[model samples]
Target: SVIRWCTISSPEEKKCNNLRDLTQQERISLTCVQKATYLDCIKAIANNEADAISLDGGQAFEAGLAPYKLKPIAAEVYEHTEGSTTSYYAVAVVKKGTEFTVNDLQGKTSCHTGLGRSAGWNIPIGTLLHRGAIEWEGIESGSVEQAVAKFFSASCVPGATIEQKLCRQCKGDPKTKCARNAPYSGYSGAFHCLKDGKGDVAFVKHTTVNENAPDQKDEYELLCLDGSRQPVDNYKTCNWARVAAHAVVARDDNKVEDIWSFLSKAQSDFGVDTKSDFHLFGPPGKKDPVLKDLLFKDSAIMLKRVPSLMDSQLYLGFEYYSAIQSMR
Candidate 1:
């Protein structure tokens, strides 16, 4: 028997191919299936064309809902002093001298990693709405994007083409404007938007600010939900939400043990610090640095099997699940 791992891009496919080759020597029949997007991969797995695919928390929520009914089989574990973490904090980063708090973002220019991403879009926007910072009658009565566009003077939420103001702060040319690969698109890019004084605040993961501006770490602070601010290192006490890490999803019918068995074997042989020719947690090689986190996050130290009872809703905790629901 073989497990068909679905991939979204050529680079991911190539990495998946390497995984297949390496695991084959272990007598594990791993195969790669190419799809255009994570959504497509979900569909492929739902239809039994593919066996598994890794997806972000927001996308996993979508996959778990409706007809797809996919469930998380394994979660990526990032390094933490406590040992290992399957989640990360979503923090609001602002320049140290800025006077505004999380409660008063009105009319301030903002930066987000991208539309629909957990830390960038869902957690921040949804938390604001839940706390009545941004109000709408109901999900059916209005669009969250419109409310956010009005709340912020301007923003650089990549992939938000429908809301003009949301992409106003983006610095990309026409072709790349408001795209995922735009100038100010990801966590580091969003942090740079604030670093360059292009926006008053940026919604990004907790580690973003320090990771990007380590030399000037004291220059940025985290905006707490209680209308206060704290040093970026205090994210644990002052964050918008705790975001679930990306997880590998498979159809409900797929045996969880089988999926974890293959993943565990692959990681033990090629995971971080291993002397294997291919590293499972990072890019295929140093030459292709841009293709980092091909099949799993580069930051991941290992893959932890999800508890059998933990569906997407449980994996994304109650507070986070409610936040995402409010946005929808």
Candidate 2:
């Protein structure tokens, strides 16, 4: 059967097409289905219109919920060394001289990568809720967004819609403001939000500071959960959570083995360090400089087949799973 890969952006679609073309020689049939967003892609896969899509941890959680019932078939691997991990740290960042710690974020202007993203939303907010630092009545009486809005003076949590305060610090125009493509919507963008002085703190992946402000390392600091502060490099000790990397999700009943086999072939042909013109793990390059992490994360070095028994919740592990559960 042809593998129908669901993509969320024009750049992703273009890259998917490139993969389809290149992998034809291997006799691995591939097709691309484009959606406007990851949620839409999940819906397509559930409807059997698409076979799979790579999703972040939070999105995978949603995909594994009641209606979608998707399972992660393969996980992106970043590090190759022994004891290497398929995870990254979620950290709270602030200007170097900021007086507040993780415990002092109340009423502060916050920046987040995106509403449902692992590092930006789930881990950070889930951590706050777990720590009793923020109070949410529940999904029935009030939303997590509303409670977060009430807790923080203002925030730029892109993709938030229920509470307007969540979009207060967003830098995009009228239509784009608070949208996923907003200037302050991703890791680097959220870090830039703090750098531009628009927000007091940014919830992002640990690598964000080094990726965005490598030279000015001393200018930014991390907020430790112990109500203290530490340099960004100390994220292993100060981070909010160890977030899972993105995974390719397919319907629970689908032939995941076939999906894994196809992906295995695709990676060996076009994964990192490939001599082919198409790079499956990277963006479309100059053709779409603005787009990134096309079919797979650019940071991913390889794809590891997930154990058959592992669903999204199990893959997220108990602690992170409970954190997300607390929010919903």
Candidate 3:
């Protein structure tokens, strides 16, 4: 079982100590290639530097493009309201009774899942662009990165700090450019930025507040496009939009099946079950207790086979695809 998953080494390197030993017993060799961004990992795969990597919806869409020629060999499935599916809702959440409305999002501090992430960036920015929010206008010729900096009073975009001013609200040292290792990066980190009172709103998925601040769910609320607010659990009615979750992607060549082969039993030996010390879902954490969704989404139960290009576009939604396409 020699499977190498490309890991994004942000504040720290991604490694599974238990997996190293567990795979040995199963005659499987598990390894990682430390890179700074998913794009770099894409390049690595093209040159046979790495075998596979789990990508969020936006990353998956970007990877399915020409240069890399990668495909989604497997997908992360989630058990939800309707049933188990490969999709989830992207919601915009804010503190309860903040007196802030979607109409007044301009000049407000914000938190995002990460740069190029679906829920965190594309969905929100796409909607904002459609509505012609004052925050998103006149930046067509400029970098979206710069627009975000000028739009939000401050922000934590994780891996996207071309604007040092945006990192003002981040918990990490601005000197590092608020890297992914920053305390205010991923899903949990974005919500944490709001919870810590550093941001006015957080763009994340539905389960974010539930997992990070279960008790404080009552203290928070969702921001709806209708310029209204709702309770945390009311995502079905108040979600910004639904989107595809992360997927396990690999080169669309021979190694594609090779990855699927290793992943088939890898989960059995080291999956989300409590019995396993090496988890394929949950990632390791650090000082802030921030869970890094290293190789795969911590919530994925199983990796189902799926077509990469056509399926991913449909799975991620037309609006989402249009949004990222506009940015490109």
Candidate 4:
């Protein structure tokens, strides 16, 4: 049976019900079946259940985009003129007890967790891949020595500061730390980076201010994306990593515009504010003097300085940007 895999929508039940009640005339076109799962949708596809999974890019490409074909049809289309709950970002940080020059970490064991789920792996790696410099061979498999060996084999001294998301900060023993915490802080998934005592070297996402993390000891950092050690030279902490070409692609048959349309509408009708939009949450790009001034007090600025952090009540969540284009 041909099953169309998808994520669930609270308001999607009506559509499901309508399909169930389809008349014989409609049944003919229903040859293709549909299925939804709350779990990692792409993983479901990788698991071989559905022919392909409809999912965001980043990791889809980060995970190497092997076996399956990855096709990006168009640019990211937003309905609200804002971003989405999902995006690609990353920062550079040091594993606990491993504060070293960005160059030192070169040929070290760095990971892009399940691919660029957040911009963590994608963005930093994306920048590197584009440099056409600092080539890498990835970590070796099986044994620890092999992993180290692989890291060294692919090491290419970067000439400038590279961009990477510091996924987490380790306040504990470097030998005993967890890398990955929660995607959105206080969320799900506890697969940390450190095994015996290894915490994440870099983090991914917007700003890591609040201590609402799985492990309260986690910290955040934002570093440069160039291929040099500037972030570490000036910051004194960073990892040796590289960038790779990547993006979010839909399933083989899925239409990129359809997803883009949904994202755009989600931003607008969903309530993304205008003034307080970038102010409250901070726009994409690197942090600036103005944003740094509001640092530590980011949330506080949300109410005081940011006029976009939902000044008006939006039960739907978005702060009201523009109306989603009517579906044609």
- Regions more than 4 Å wrong, model 3: 10-17, 134-140, 283-289, 308-318
- Rank by TM-score, descending? 2, 3, 1, 4
Model 1 TM-score on a 0 to 1 scale: 0.86
Cα lDDT of model 1 by residue, 1-328, tens digit = 6789998767889989988887786544689999865778899999989889887798888889879989999888876769989988889898888688777788999998878888888988877777778877777787878999989999889778569898888876877677665668667678777877778989888777555566788988889988889998898899877778889999877465677788888888787878987898863232222265578766678888888798889988887787677677
On lDDT, the candidate that comes out on top is: 2
Q: Candidate 2: which pairs clash? A: none
Name the lDDT value of residue 110 in candidate 4. Answer: 45
**Model 2 Cα lDDT, one tens digit per residue, 1-328:** 6889998777778878877886776545789999887889899999999989998898899899978889989888875246457877889898987686777778999999889899889988877887888887788899889889989999999889898899999986868787776778777778778988889999987777766677888998999888879998888788777788899999887577778889898788777778887787753222221354567765678888888899888999987788788787
Clashing pairs in 1: none
lDDT of each: 0.80, 0.82, 0.75, 0.29
Candidate 4 lDDT tens digits, 1-328: 1233232322233333332234124212211124433234454544544332223233333222355443432222221115322221234543334445444555454433322232343334534433443344343424222322233322111110122222222222333222222221111111133221333334332222221232432433334443343322233223323121122234444443443443233223222254322231223222321222111112111111111222111211121111100000
Worst 10 residues of 1 by lDDT: 283-292
What candidate 1 gets wrong by more than 4 Å, as runs, is 171-173, 180-183, 195-198, 282-292
TM-score of each: 0.86, 0.91, 0.90, 0.37
Residue 259, candidate 3: C-alpha displacement in angstroms: 1.0
Question: What TM-score number comes out for model 4?
Answer: 0.37
Clashes of 1: 0
